[PDB]
DNA sequence: TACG
């Protein structure tokens, strides 16, 4: 009634968060509106679903998970080994399988059967409220399609939990809404961990063309006849023109990592190297897309997933050649084998469709809200609901004797940082996560310390990570973690499982091509490149990490930032003190906390 | 105008 949404800041899994949710479900039910809960990770899906299970004992909870065939089709990964995939190709795949089962070939998909609609399947979904992953597993266990089972339950569900990537895919969203029986103005969308929304928008809005993707198209060309596209140019010949253009661009234009270019430079290289006009190259690119259509048709008629690398490559290159420089940066990279990318700078375009529904923007760290509102384009009321935790139970401080600042980071600054970290841990003797801006800084600091610790290392798998986490809760001590990893957001350590956090430097972003573009974009639009591309994301990282510490009225903890430049984050963390020796001051804080 |  007031606006098209509301932004609520308060810790996750909390009393006032559950309340806001309870208020949203009553408001929704009163106006015959269904509820859509969007989440970005399995971890956050589980937290949200746990919350809803508690509430099912008090109130009417008619809820399911919903994910797309990409995650929920059991068959296609058993039948194909594809490295790229989409909703569209799987719809064509599945429809063909379902035809074959209706015509008497039950083995075509053995997951497509009566159990899709059975009382037992409907009961597990509605009475048990599984995560998507748990329901996937239940599907395997019972030889029943998770996707089609979710789809069949959908019309009777008042509440759906789904990924951002699922709902923000327009064509998938239209079919979902259509099968749910509802328009966009007939729903309330809860945006879990909404501080991710800008990155979510930019991520969904961006696309790229890699050399490996071209290589995959090259092999596809061999396998399906490699026909003439025009006078003496076969499909493979065109892929070589595209691949060599991209390779030459990378060699000639990038040094260390990514570089910004103009979108039309790709077309320029194609034109000069192969001695053709723009029309001729565009005609060839269209011919490649048509060959893609043929590849789809061929795969489809033998029961394969009709996804074509030639099609995907063709449509992405054509899209790249026609992007407008205003909202998008053309990025050229040597990383991951070589690629060219349309990087979305402004996520408000992608997020705009969410205004057609009511949105509730939930997060522990939305402040400073002006920046969030400017970046997402959401002009909505902001409220700091939630517990005022007693300030005496928390100590937040920074120490200015060291810094992770790049151009002053030599071996002596590293020695200094390690010494301070070691002094704190050995004196305080509490359960600690040390957060590093990079694996590089972590490894170099790790090489200068003696104390035992666990480590969240680059490329660690799910089993090793849960094991280390369960070891931390049980055996206690110290974890070395990195800013972009899985301990920075999300995870809850109740009681004295987490008592201290040390930020070994500040996690300022890299001045890469995308970030240097964001700076220029926010300079032009607001005159505040520094604040919006550098200060803001850094502030949120810091607050998210500190937010791990106090999870209760009676919870006790210390956070210390080991960086000179931390004073400039006082505006966002007002209780932060300076300390000239954190070891004693944190030690003394715990003595006083223990005395009560 | 920052440094995975
Ligand atoms: S029924 Fe399910 S498992 Fe079978 S093809 Fe369709 S989506 Fe895949
Ligand atoms: Na089975
Ligand atoms: Na070739």
Author numbering: 20 to 615
Sentences from the paper on this structure:
Based on the available structure of a TaXPD–DNA complex, we inserted a E542C mutation in the new ‘no cysteine’ native protein to form an intermolecular disulphide between TaXPD and alkanethiol-modified oligonucleotide DNA. Unambiguous unbiased electron density was observed for the 4 nt (TACG) from the 5′- end of the DNA after refinement of the protein. Additionally, some density for the—(CH)6—linker and weak density of the fifth nucleotide (adenosine) that cannot be clearly interpreted appeared after refinement of the first four nucleotides. The covalent TaXPD–DNA complex agrees with the previous reported TaXPD–DNA structure, in that it shows the strand bound to the HD2 domain.
The mechanism of XPD helicase activity remains unclear with uncertainties about the binding of the 3′-end of the translocated DNA strand, the positioning of the junction between single- and double-stranded DNA and the role of protein conformational change in unwinding the DNA.
